[PDB]
Point group: C3
Chain length 172, copies 3
């Protein structure tokens, strides 16, 4: 099975071109830097429209065959922040451990980490994980959860992915 | 106008069996650390799920509270339905609150994992479940209060700020 | 008033189940009986088993092992949620936390805990190392939780794990 990783930036302003997407860039740069195995990327930038988020996640998993989808944006307390809701809506099983750890890690930086509603779940053979917005926060987040990602994908029947032990160790 | 609701959910407190030291502890905490004008909507009710839901809704919808702090009814016993009532009236929950509150509470109380305290949003009002003991109330508040004012900003609620020497309310600055 | 504890191994020798039984026998100092069940990874059968133990055998505590991962057939958490009327988020939170110390993949665990009548049900992992850290972390609050839901009296050896009360 070929590894295809989805990167979805959820932001009205970003989708309107009001500002450049440094978040999606940070995610792709991180993946290219740590993943040893071969893989393709399916990048998407969309406004925070609930239906568009769900339709986009489903397209990447079902039609593009992504084994992993990383989202960035729309995970705070504000009413328009519906990325977690969209994620739950397309997944059959949620993984509470992801949200717990990502908040734990963020707490080391700022107390507002408890306002994050980022989560993760499974849709078929695809793992979907909600990431933060800031490039630095994205890096710290992935260093924390990436070690468990390749194995999780193995368990749901997704493509094989491995990372550079000197960068981040994919625990198996 | 900043209006903060304080709801004590206790059958015995509502009947006049015990003095509400919990509610009093919360009000004293608020007055001690908040450095902006605010009014309090204090309520003491028995642990009746329907009444809890009606009270939270009234304080949020009619009294215009931007923050509601509850105390009591968050344990494993069948009658403790504060979390259930809170989830029922909120449109969006915030798992980080319950997570951190249980985390800072166990280093002292091993039964902290039995607490079902949570927090959520109803319109422009943040609702947070606190423990009963005045000691635990201060610990929980010192842990989550730093994020409360900003969370309220984000949901369109009233402006609240705290004495940085007591509690630092973190807010991103340009 | 009799203390009965259920131990359910969920998987299509039972090291994991043995570990739990040994733990219970080692730390509990009060009289109690164990109802042991080994069943396949079928949600309905898991649900019926938990109900049989809680309702018919009168268990005050049920500890499960297996079926808590991300795979499609790991449905223990779903079955547990289905039979309980009140869930305890604090359990899964702490168990994943202590487990994460050696197992990075601990965040893939969907273990939880809930209450069905006067019975507390807790999902444990499959590996002995994880089962131990998990029990050492939550057992201190189990006897008291059982008291609060009206279950049987259980107490532990203070030199192994102190049950708060």
């Amino acid at each position: 099975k070929k590894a295809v990783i989805g990167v979805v930036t959820i932001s009205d302003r970003a989708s309107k071109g009001i500002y450049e997407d440094i978040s999606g860039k940070a995610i792709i740069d991180y993946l290219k830097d740590v993943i040893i195995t071969p893989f393709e990327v399916e990048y998407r930038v969309i406004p925070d429209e609930r239906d568009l988020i769900e339709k986009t996640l489903i397209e990447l998993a079902d039609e593009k065959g992504c084994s992993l989808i990383l989202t960035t944006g729309g995970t705070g307390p504000a009413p328009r922040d519906v990325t977690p809701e969209a994620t739950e809506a397309v997944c059959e099983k949620m993984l509470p451990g992801f949200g717990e750890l990502m908040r734990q890690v963020s707490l080391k930086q700022v107390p507002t980490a408890i306002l994050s509603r980022q989560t993760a779940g499974i849709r078929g053979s695809c793992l979907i994980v909600n990431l933060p917005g800031k490039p630095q926060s994205i890096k710290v987040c992935l260093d924390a959860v990436m070690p468990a990602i390749p194995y999780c994908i193995d368990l749901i029947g997704g493509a094989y992915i491995d990372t550079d032990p000197n960068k981040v160790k994919a625990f198996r």
